[PDB]
Design a binder for this molecule. Structure first.
Ligand SMILES: Nc1ncnc2c1ncn2[C@@H]1O[C@H](COP(=O)(O)OP(=O)(O)O)[C@@H](O)[C@H]1O
Ligand SMILES: Nc1ncnc2c1ncn2[C@@H]1O[C@H](COP(=O)(O)OP(=O)(O)O)[C@@H](O)[C@H]1O
Ligand SMILES: [Mg+2]
Ligand SMILES: [Mg+2]
Lengths: 284, 286, 284, 286
């Protein structure tokens, strides 16, 4: 097997390759004077199962993935397998309203056209998996998150909204903890919060888990609610830590700690999903 | 017909739309907080021949094109036709080292999969046309360049290298002028330039034509050479004026004027290719 | 047998002849006033197996080889066998890009046209061996390098890149040592290094081995990385020490010692490959 | 047709190309850090008759020729034709002692293996032509030398030794002049020179012709002899002006002017052989 480690995924890809006892093959990569992307893989990939590891979120990441999918055609490979730790454009994904692209559809079609399989960790909505002609697997960071928090004092695991429930239920079951979620809705300029079930959080230590942190708005609002009601400690975790300005500070206004995975590498990437990805690679 | 005018081609697409008496339909476009691209076309495009006009060279331009090609599937269209006035990655049309992408191949395959036709103006190498499943037409700015310079005093049309010759031959013939090219080559840290044929440029007014100006190195050097040998005027034109890293100023150190087309819009875009693109559009109908 | 010792290979050729108990036959050689090369072999080579030993890298070396291949036709020899310790133009060898010569192809064809066999020590890429009509053997300096380092304190043998792996694996196996390689790639103006496997080099003694040292750039960059990470001693070896200005000083910025073979004779030629070449001659 | 102009022959090859209305194609050429030679020809040479023009006497020239012969195999050519205006190693065309190379033999064999024809101008000894598998033509600078000296006041054409006689006979006949040669020989540390026939050169203007000037010894000596016997003017010409070790100055101690051809370019290259080479090229076609 050959692991290809793209720019966005150097850390996780390196962790993966080390575990698999193989080279994290990196491209030579630069921009031409006119801004066009150049890539080169001088290693002979002929006859190998190839695992390309890189995110598909930014314009540059998409170009790096597409150009890599062309570059490796220089070799008669055994298979080509895309693993995008964080999959871009899975922000639904459908049309609302009309004349909007189903971006994850066309992008998934493209990727699927040039690969034998695709996988990602905790896609934002599973409908997107259906857009692939090849098998598109949804891996989960649950076990890695459970491993991290097994040695932490937690009273409840909490979803910030009424959608990340299955993940919170599974993680809490694995930690042997109770769980609940917060429903937040805006009704005529005023905000209304419901806890479900209506757990008493006074003096309690809470682990809030979500799939993505972008602006941090959702998590920060929920942390503030819980701190207000007397939560004694709030840990914030997510799979994909995008942290667009200035999400970190909004969240730490009321949360004590932030721990996300290495799907998107940042200073808060304390939890690695390499084992989960290695399992997939081993079983593919 | 519906003309979609993407961000990179607003000037040219608007000129095209106005000539064809139709709307230059622009997307509502913005970036999500996380930096992903959002587009929306609220106009009803159902049952029309669609012409999407936008360049394909920057990362953002490629995303704009691809996401537009997804957006239009929300409508039952008659046809979908891509026109990329400047076609990106046409310089990477083969592998020059093992493990390189043939970038123009994969990108052309993608565009072709979601359209009924593709067209560009003066592609850097026509090999790339063969990467397309649908008809991929190579339009030419020649007549537009001729129309501009028929009112300029020109003695010779010149290619700055031994590659853009057919264009220089065609343009010069339509101006009623003679032409030559410059061959520049490095031989052991020394540069040698040959003029072919070895035209005496003393007191002569020269029009240098190339397909793309990016770093402007070859043209700036040739301009200096020709100025050195006594050229009285030097005009520099190219179809695609990218102008990276001071290129226009390096060229103007020795050339008198730069005039490029509006395939890539800049302050040097004095020659519009709108009529050439309009003719192509009329041919494909609508 | 007759050994012919050409200008570039006087030292190794002498070592070879002494071991074989035979004369290292040298040409009378000078330049005509107009710069043309003159050679003469006044010894009677009739009826002997001839072994011409000389490098094929510089313009002058190529002319010396070609003119020697003509000069010896004055004698009815038993066989003519070329041994080029360092083989020039094996810098790939193919066309990248187009309109480039496959230099090692035409040169190998020429040599093969005038000989019964060719051999070299550690050719830079084995594709070149296929360009010969006669048997073209690739000899290896591995055993001589192992002999040298058997009495040196070494923790790991290291390849400076992901291509000289088989040599490093064989040498380390013979020394009873672990090994690893460094993958270096440039990604957007910044440099990225991976160790494979990700060996801890803190306080460790490293032997870095490569086939050729030219500008010393590759080796010097890798030595610097390892010194930076706490390597306690770095030995640098290569088969062919070209050392173009000012490679030696770049390398010794962070390496402790340089030891190369006598394929290309320099002040750093501490390791002789005469036994390896004698084996080939004996078995031909 | 495609003309390739190698480093050593840029002046002559350019003159040839211009006469034939074609590009003098030069390689991009440089040395790798380790001193090995790099060449690249990016022009598409497919389907053309190729004429490679470069000398073959220095180590670098030989490498340039050989590597060019490899480079052109990257193209499907109609034919490959070597023209080495000055052909190196033609002085070593046999063994004069045991164990010497016949250098012109092996080199000719190499060139012939990778071309369809070879040509040179005034080879030092025509024996070498027989070493070539393909047709190896020996062109002559005679008419070019005549064209130059038809406008010079000349009484006799002279060979400086008893070897270059046919050339001196031909040139003198075309100038309408008489001729003689000098025989110089060493007999016991004393030099004896005979003029054949024993022409009185007092007050006479002499044109000395030889194929090659290298160290210039024979010509400098003969010039001094003729000056001593009262020659009023002495012109020295040769096809190949190598000029080693002060040769031109040693000659000019007693000769009035030196004029050689452009087979080897120097400041003395006043007589171009471009027309002779062009005629040959036209014959082989393209
Ligand atoms: N956007 C770009 N800007 C500059 N150079 C590029 C770009 N894309 C590709 N290239 C490079 O240009 C080279 C090919 O150009 P060129 O040497 O003219 O050969 P060709 O005749 O095949 O075009 C390749 O090395 C390729 O990697
Ligand atoms: N490039 C050269 N410069 C000077 N002398 C040379 C060169 N190449 C060969 N020779 C020598 O010139 C001699 C042959 O010349 P010459 O005596 O005129 O006999 P021939 O009549 O056969 O030419 C030989 O000794 C040969 O080694
Ligand atoms: Mg190019
Ligand atoms: Mg002689």
């Amino acid at each position: 097997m050959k692991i290809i480690a793209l720019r966005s995924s150097l850390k996780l890809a390196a962790r993966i390759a080390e575990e698999l006892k193989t080279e994290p093959v990196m491209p030579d990569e630069r921009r031409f004077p006119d801004g066009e992307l150049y890539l080169r893989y001088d290693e002979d990939l002929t006859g190998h199962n190839i695992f390309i590891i890189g995110n598909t979120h930014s314009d540059a990441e998409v170009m790096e993935m597409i150009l890599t999918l062309s570059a490796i055609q220089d070799y008669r490979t055994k298979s080509v397998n895309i693993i995008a730790p964080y999959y871009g454009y899975a922000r639904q994904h459908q049309r609302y309203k009309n004349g909007e692209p189903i971006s994850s559809q066309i992008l998934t079609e493209i990727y699927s056209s040039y690969s034998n399989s695709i996988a990602t960790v905790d896609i934002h909505d599973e409908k997107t998996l259906s857009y692939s002609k090849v098998k598109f697997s949804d891996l989960h960071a649950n076990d890695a998150i459970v491993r991290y928090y097994k040695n932490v004092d937690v009273d409840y695991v909490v979803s910030p909204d009424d959608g990340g429930l299955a993940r919170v239920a599974d993680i809490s079951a694995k930690l042997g903890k109770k769980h609940f979620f917060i429903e937040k809705k805006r009704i005529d300029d005023r905000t209304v919060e419901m806890k479900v079930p209506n757990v008493d959080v006074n003096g309690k230590k809470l682990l809030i888990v979500d799939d993505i942190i972008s602006t941090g708005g959702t998590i920060a609002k929920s942390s503030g609610l819980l701190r207000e009601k007397g939560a004694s400690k709030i840990y914030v975790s997510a799979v994909h830590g995008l942290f667009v300005n200035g999400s970190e500070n909004k969240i730490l206004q009321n949360a004590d700690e932030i721990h996300v995975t290495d799907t998107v590498e940042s200073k808060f990437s304390d939890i690695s999903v390499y084992q989960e990805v290695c399992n997939y690679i081993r079983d593919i």
